[PDB]
Amino acid sequence: VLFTRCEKARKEKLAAGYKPLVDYLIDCDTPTFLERIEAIQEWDRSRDDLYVWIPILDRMDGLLLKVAEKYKYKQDPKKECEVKLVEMEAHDVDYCLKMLKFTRRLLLNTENRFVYSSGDVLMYLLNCPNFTIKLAVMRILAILGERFVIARHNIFGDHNLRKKTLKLALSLSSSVMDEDGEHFSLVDLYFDKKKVPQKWRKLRFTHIKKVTMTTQELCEHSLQQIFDKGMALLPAESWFDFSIKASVAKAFSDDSGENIDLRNIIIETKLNAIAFVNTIFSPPQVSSKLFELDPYAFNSLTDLISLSETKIPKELRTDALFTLECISLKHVWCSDIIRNLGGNISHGLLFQILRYIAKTLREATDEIDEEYNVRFFYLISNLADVKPLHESLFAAGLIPTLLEIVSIRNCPYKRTLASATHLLETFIDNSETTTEFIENDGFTMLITSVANEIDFTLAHPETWQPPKYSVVYYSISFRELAYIRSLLKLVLKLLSTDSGDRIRNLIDSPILVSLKKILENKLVFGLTLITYTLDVVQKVINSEPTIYPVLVEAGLIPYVIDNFPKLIGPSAELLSLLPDVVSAICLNPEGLKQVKEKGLINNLFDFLLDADHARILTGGDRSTEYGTDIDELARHYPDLKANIVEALCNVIRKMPSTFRNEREFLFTSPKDQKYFFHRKNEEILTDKEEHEPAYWELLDKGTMLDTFTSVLFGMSLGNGSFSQVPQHLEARDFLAIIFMENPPYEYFTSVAISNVTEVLQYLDEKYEDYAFMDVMKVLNDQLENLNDFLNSPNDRSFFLERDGENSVRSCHSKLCRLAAILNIVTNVYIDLTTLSCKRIMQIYSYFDKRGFSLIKNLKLLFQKCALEEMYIRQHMPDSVITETMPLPIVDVSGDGPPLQIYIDDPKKGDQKGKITSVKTRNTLQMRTILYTLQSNTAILFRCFLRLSHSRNMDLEHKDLTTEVHIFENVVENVIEMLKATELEGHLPYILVLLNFNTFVFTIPKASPNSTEILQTIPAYIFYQKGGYLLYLHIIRDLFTRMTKIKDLSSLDNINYIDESNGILTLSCLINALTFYNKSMQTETMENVQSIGKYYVSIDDDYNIMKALTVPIKVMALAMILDLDKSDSLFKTQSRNVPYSVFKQLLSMLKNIFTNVNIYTKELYELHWDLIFPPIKKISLFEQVGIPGDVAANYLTDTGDDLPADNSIGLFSPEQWEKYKKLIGEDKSIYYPQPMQAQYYKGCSSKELDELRDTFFNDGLPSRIFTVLPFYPKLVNAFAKTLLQIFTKYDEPTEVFAGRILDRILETDLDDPATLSSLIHLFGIFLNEKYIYQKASHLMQRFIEYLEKSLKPEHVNTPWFSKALYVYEIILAKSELPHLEELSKDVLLRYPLLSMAKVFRIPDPMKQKLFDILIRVSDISNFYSALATSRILIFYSRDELYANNIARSGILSRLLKVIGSFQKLDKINFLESSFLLLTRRCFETTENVDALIRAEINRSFTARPAVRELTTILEEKAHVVMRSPSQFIDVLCETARFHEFDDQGALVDYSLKRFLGEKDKNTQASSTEKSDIYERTGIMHLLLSQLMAASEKDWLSEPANSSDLPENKKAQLDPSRNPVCAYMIFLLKLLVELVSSYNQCKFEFLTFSRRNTYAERPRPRTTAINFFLYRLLDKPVGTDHDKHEAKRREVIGMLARSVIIGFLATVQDDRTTKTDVKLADPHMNFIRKFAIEAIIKAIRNATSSSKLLESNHLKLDMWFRIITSMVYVQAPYLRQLLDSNKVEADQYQLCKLVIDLGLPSVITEAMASIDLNYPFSKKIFNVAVEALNTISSTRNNFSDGIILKSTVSRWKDIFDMFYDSKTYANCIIPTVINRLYKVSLALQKDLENKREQEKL
């Protein structure tokens, strides 16, 4: 029963209505219980909820779950031993059917049926030999399935049940064959026309097996005998089937006087099973599994349901009819149902039944199956949803026929007449149906019947049969109240049509006076009839206001107005019309005047003071839309805004008197009378109640307020009648309904505190001075009443100290109010995202006037609520702690105040709902309140410390002296909290405090990630008061605590803060050293202005943010040095410091040694009373003889000059001589004094420089090699810190690099880890340009070392990767374009620039290392493979090196690594590196050249003389870097460059395309015999790996996931199967290679598992066949493995793309020659060979239809391939091949298919398909789809898978290696050195000269 808290509260109150009902059924022995159950039968009331019946269901479920065990029918899904076939005892059936027969009568007359939970005993009961039990259990299952299909528990997936249902449906067949008849349909059973076929009359059952019990063996054995005999033979897995079949045979065995009864039961069960199957199963699944086996279902169903037949069983009629009500729920079956019934003709069966229904109703001969009629109407109303069927029934005479029923007079069968009237309402939607109803005098009989019913009902009060077991407001039989409700609800739907006519028909009728009889008798007709009666009155006035006088004469409106309060009751639909009923009465000015008088607006709000009425309205959408309608009633009639307000206020002013102390929320435990635990080892009194207590929505107030604040939230939208409430309502009166005096613990979570924060946020933007100062006074006064909780001992829990008293109850109640107040405050008024200027001024005024008493209390609240969540967790068993963890609260996302100290990994999942108790609820209520009292108390302090600095406003002197005065009081309180407790025993508290300090003192990250910037001025005051001297004494105390821990290694692998002293002692040491590194980085610090802003009596005006760092570093560095003194670090090899604590101590040094351009000598204390116009002086002047504002000017002009020794121009003699007596001899006080030294002797920049020197000269950088080997996890930090140190103390870093290298050249290789770290550091240093230029000698020596030391056998050591990393750093630079120098005075002026030099490795060294790296062996290290790939991508730039790489076999060894580490996350990088290296192994000078040319010319177009060269070489950097020589060469044969400059130097670098310039000299080439030659062998390896990965399970889901099995991953993750990821990678690689490079195809074409040599290798087809047949040959298919289907489709798309890419033509220089349609014989040869296989594949798949059944899924793809081929479009493709070139692809591929003869090879496949095979539908459909495309294309001519084109991969390489697009600029001299003398000079001088020479 997963309900919302509101729905649960509504239903728990609704269930209180059926207390007499439950008590009447649950207070009986048991024989009586069944006796009462068997007397319910017919409902005389509305459809009850199932929730209120649940207790009866449980008493019944238990009774069944005990009789199930009696016969062992109880099954255990997992054990297929099956329950032994044992016929249930006769008497014991009645006991089991009196209950299962009532579960139908209950589940039909009940809604919210989804709460049913007994669908487990049903499975256990289904495995029962007896069918009657099975009949009932299947009827109930069918009803439950109907409910489910209508709704769009878990048992709808249980495959065992699915099979039981499928077999019971495929029970005795509907009709098969008889020698003297067509098929003996089931209906024939009851006609003595055909005799039952003898096949049914005997038994023959299989499981290899065959058991037969021919008749005369089924006629003597009793059912139990047969059931046992068979099971003895057959396995238990097939006992159910034997039971069903033997029962069928024995039932048909003889035409006895009883056997027929059992046949009836079996057929009924079959029908109900069909219905259930139709519900759970999918339509295609239902057709394939159920109808395929039995296609005669419908043809039989539509024969049984015929009331005219008096021989068919009355129960079979309903069951067959019920099956159709389920089947029709899917529109696909509706058409056939109507066709079978005859719903298209007017004389069919569907209309012959309707006439018999009327015949019976017109005579009442006890042959009226009112359930039959009702369900027939449901069937028709389901068939009527299919618009084609709606029209078919309309034209067949539905309405003319249905109008013969509802026109019956004085009928007593109102169950059928009410359903017919609802069917009529549903049917009539068009104008055709409406005008056909009206035309046949339909609307005149409707209103005549309504009046007749109403008139009779009132006159005959002896026919009233109201319910006696529900709470209702009528006195008439529900039958009559429903018939009238149906007539009225159709009278309403017929009024939205041409109401001008319908309203005139109403007037000339007795309807109007018969409606005043409904209104003048409400206790008779109830409220659902008054809701429909008042809806006509309001819908009749709003469409014809001229009728208002008539409605007044009849006396309706006069009665509506004079009895309005009498007409309101707890009915949701009634209450949603009252605003619309007043908006119609008000259309008449006299009506409006009467509404103003008589208080018809006071009645639209007064009902909200009643819990019963508020609960019905809910408090959600219906409640809000009742407010937005009141506002409309104010708009249309602005004359009522004076009454909607005088009523609203009178409601808000009266609620506080309706509040009562209903419940108590804290309960003492029964045993000890203590609310809370008192030890970690108490005994838990487990209960079965709800773990989370809910009291709000179950209260008379939680509904009243939840509804009222929803009305208010609706009415707040836009200005209206609510906007004027403040002008009439005091703020206090509005805050007496929100801040109740005893709310529950969940009040601040309610919707009354989520709507009233939208009402108060709307009264804020407008009335900014209305509530604020009152909300704050309420806060301050509530916190002032907790003067005994806040001001209590800090060494014990205030609550535990008085457990069992009332103060525990009378204090938690105060904190519950304080929790809603603070949630209001921090959500409405003080929000860092909403702080406006006026809000800030309001805060300043509040603190000026009321005083700083609120902050001294907010500190005490956070301090005591953190001491009570620690003293209480030190007395609670760990299970309780993980149960009562309060974080999972609405809205709140943690991420801030009080840190949660878990006991179990939160990332694991949930842990609540495994234990409960009185105590486990009394502490979940406490720890939840305590959590928001601290969470909201920390957001308040964050805002109290930002204030103006958020808006950056300009402030006055009194508006600054206060801000710096709030900052001074929030910080002296943050310190008082830290200075109070002691770490010993309160560590969990010091961890909350140190996260609170780091939260208040930081601003949110103003970016998606960003970081928490520091609040500089609060931090400055913090230091001023000694806030960092405290963090030192905390850190020198948490460092001896971290040094006496044993297992410091485990701490480095934690991801959840536990309550272990170990981890706690570490967490405080990172939340301190982190706050201490944040106040030292000018990037994490807020850039406040200079000190002069505040003081003027200073010496040096410094930037406060910059000047604060120095004092901080002078202490941090001193503490560090002291630490090194005490044998802790930079010494010892035992790693005395965890990884994270050392990460901070290293960023503490990069900052300690960063220099900020400011030399501070002394820092002045920031004091609010000493800011300029010093108040400490101005206030004193005020004390005697105020020079008001003149004193201000006096100090402003004298520059803060204290009147020296006499009154001069002011200070009258009496004013003086007093200023003398005052002004004590301490003139210092009135000036900003300098800060004192902290920790160190002097915290000035001089001392910072003097300590950094001492640290520097102690050779700690020379002591760095003594630590580095042990902390390899962080060497970049070790580098940045060291580089910063050296930069600060300018020193040649090259010297330190040499020192590192010398260590390497003497480090034994037996130290892999020291060598790894050392090489990583060396590589990191070389990565900086300012040191690279000075390391040529170092890099040469490194190359040497590598050559002499490195051996291929080291590939698996962890230092190999770093050695290759440094080598790559050297290489990338070494392979930059060879810089050329300007020559022969190229001029151009503008001195070029010249770029930095680059170390150039001697060529032999490259070769000697390459010959070492290609020779490596099997790699078991991911990082070795990654580094080798990155290095080899460089050598592959040269074809000669790529040849060696490919022939080496290195690629196989890398693919092995790729395959092995397919689960490792970073496998993507290795995948990409391998892809790039392989792509580079196929690229050749020719292909390169072609693409290089195609790139530059495409740059020259742009399509926005042009193209400044400095852009081409900065946008095509990858293009140049692939082959700079070729780029230069091609660039010189065009782009001959313009703008020679006036003198001819060359001013700018813009180039001219110069198409044809330099002539068109060109060479020729033929290719062939090279691609044919190539046989690189890479494709052999890739295909071998894929063809080997196919065998392994690339479909099976891996073992399991443990946290998101039914979550996250679900099927979302298709790469979990390790082989699939390997397969996916290989397939993507294959697509890219086969679609990019021509040589790749010839390898795919001639692939062969045995790599035998054959010049011009034979074009084998092993690969193509593998892709077509074998690759997707994994049978599986069965079951419903979502993951397997996903993987199959993914591989299908990838394989299809592979073939299309294999058939496409590679993009090349021939871009604009797309016009050419010549083709290529080789490309042709590829396509003929490929298609000719698919043809040859189809002509095998087709013949021998036997074969077709197997190759029926392969044929579904071979046809899709044909579609993609001729529509040149495949999944995941089209990123690679030019769109210009796919004109011949489609065209030529078509032309080929036509020529090949494959518009007809498809047809011959269709001409050989026995259509009986179900898949034929699919095969035929796609086969046409391919033909459609082929013809379509012919006419014109008369997911996480990223694939990228070749050049895009060059870009990838460039991105990985060169981190600068500038580098390509290096060749600029070359082009300048090249064409210019012979290009620019020549062309230009000639061009301008010849044209000039022309004239």
Residue numbers in the entry: 2 to 153, 159 to 213, 236 to 1532, 1539 to 1872, 2220 to 2276
Can you list sentences taken from the study reporting this PDB entry?
Tom1p has been implicated in the turnover of excess levels of small, basic proteins including ribosomal components and histones. We determined cryo-EM structures of Tom1p to reveal a helical repeat solenoid architecture for the 2,888 residues preceding the C-terminal HECT domain and an overall architecture that resembles the published structures of HUWE1 but with a larger fraction of ordered residues.
We performed single-particle cryo-EM reconstructions of two Tom1p constructs: full-length Tom1p that contained a 20-residue tag including 12 histidines inserted between residues K1074-D1075 (Tom1p^His^; physiologically active in all phenotype assays) and Tom1p^ΔAD^ with the C-terminal Protein A described for intact Tom1p above ([Fig fig2], presumably inactive). The two maps and structural models were very similar to each other, indicating that neither the internal affinity tag, the absence of the acidic domain, or the presence of a C-terminal Protein A scar induced notable conformational changes. Unless otherwise noted, the higher resolution Tom1p^ΔAD^ map was used for descriptions and illustrations herein. 2,792 (85%) of the 3,268 Tom1p residues were modeled into Tom1p^ΔAD^, which corresponds to 96% of the residues in Tom1p^ΔAD^ ([Fig fig6]). Beginning and end points of missing density in Tom1p^ΔAD^ structure: 214-235, 1873-2219 (region containing acidic domain), 2276-2316, 2399-2449, 2575-2589. The Tom1p acidic domain (residues 1873-2131), which is conserved in HUWE1, is found within a larger disordered region (residues 1871-2219), the ends of which are located on the inner face of the solenoid, suggesting that this unstructured component of Tom1p will at least partially occupy the basket ([Fig fig6], 6C). Tom1p^ΔAD^ was expressed at the normal level in yeast and the purified protein was well-behaved ([Fig fig2]), so deletion of the acidic domain did not destabilize Tom1p but did substantially reduce the affinity for Spt6p^tSH2^. Binding was not observed with Tom1p^ΔAD^ but complexes formed normally when just the Spt6p^tSH2^ binding site was removed in Tom1p^Δ11^ ([Fig fig4]).
